[PDB]
Amino acid sequence: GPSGMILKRAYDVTPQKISTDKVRGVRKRVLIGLKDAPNFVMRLFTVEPGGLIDRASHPWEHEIFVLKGKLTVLKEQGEETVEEGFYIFVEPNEIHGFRNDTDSEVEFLCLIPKEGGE
Amino acid sequence: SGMILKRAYDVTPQKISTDKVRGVRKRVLIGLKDAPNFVMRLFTVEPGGLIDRASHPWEHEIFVLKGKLTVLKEQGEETVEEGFYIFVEPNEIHGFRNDTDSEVEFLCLIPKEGGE
Ligand SMILES: [Cu+2]
Numbered sequence: 574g575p576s577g578m579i580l581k582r583a584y585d586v587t588p589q590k591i592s593t594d595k596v597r598g599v600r601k602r603v604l605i606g607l608k609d610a611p612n613f614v615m616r617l618f619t620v621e622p623g624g625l626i627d628r629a630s631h632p633w634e635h636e637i638f639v640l641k642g643k644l645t646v647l648k649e650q651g652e653e654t655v656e657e658g659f660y661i662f663v664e665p666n667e668i669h670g671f672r673n674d675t676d677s678e679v680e681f682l683c684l685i686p687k688e689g690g691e
Numbered sequence: 692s693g694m695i696l697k698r699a700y701d702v703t704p705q706k707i708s709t710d711k712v713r714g715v716r717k718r719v720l721i722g723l724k725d726a727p728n729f730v731m732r733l734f735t736v737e738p739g740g741l742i743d744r745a746s747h748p749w750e751h752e753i754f755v756l757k758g759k760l761t762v763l764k765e766q767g768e769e770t771v772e773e774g775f776y777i778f779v780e781p782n783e784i785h786g787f788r789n790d791t792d793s794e795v796e797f798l799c800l801i802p803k804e805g806g807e
């Protein structure tokens with residue numbers, strides 16, 4: 574493929590609104606997307622206060638790193654909150670979701686294999 | 692289980708000190724034991740630390756978490772700060788240095804073919 578390196582301020586990517594049956598109060602920046610990625614993509618999610626990524630599962634994993642705030646993680650059984658500096662691994666097909674129960678924006682990096690989209 | 696939630700700091704850093712890498716610690720957050728496709732590491736570069744120029748047949752996806760990171764390119768260099776992401780194409784010459792007086796941290800993901 575192509576050569577070179579991209580170095581860019583993540584906030585120079587505009588946050589795009591995500592609105593689906595199971596997602597509300599969320600915006601996403603695609604940092605390293607399908608157009609460039611050999612294998613996996615990098616997104617930066619912003620969860621607004623009260624925003625919800627409701628429980629779901631899908632045939633690919635997540636690798637997540639929490640950048641800002643207190644994130645509530647929804648599990649098959651119950652929930653647990655983590656904060657900036659936590660990582661999360663979600664195996665393929667594992668039930669998961671996220672909620673922001675705080676009054677300030679939560680941000681996390683979320684990487685998936687590119688077969689799962691961007 | 693099917694979900695791991697952990698404070699990255701709690702993962703034991705590994706000291707690296709070789710002919711090409713000095714003053715660097717590496718945490719493997721999501722490693723080969725868990726990862727179906729790609730691995731997640733967190734590097735700490737001490738003041739004056741160096742990851743010297745190299746290339747390899749896999750990409751890097753990096754996010755700068757803390758500090759001012761000097762990025763070595765095939766020729767020359769570029770400094771970036773916390774809040775920058777870096778995509779290094781496969782085979783591109785790259786490395787890293789910390790010219791500041793405090794620790795620099797960055798997240799670094801590679802496909803599993805690259806090891807952890
Ligand atoms: Cu998901």
Ligand SMILES: [Cu+2]
Binds near residue numbers: 745747785
């Ligand atoms: Cu490298």
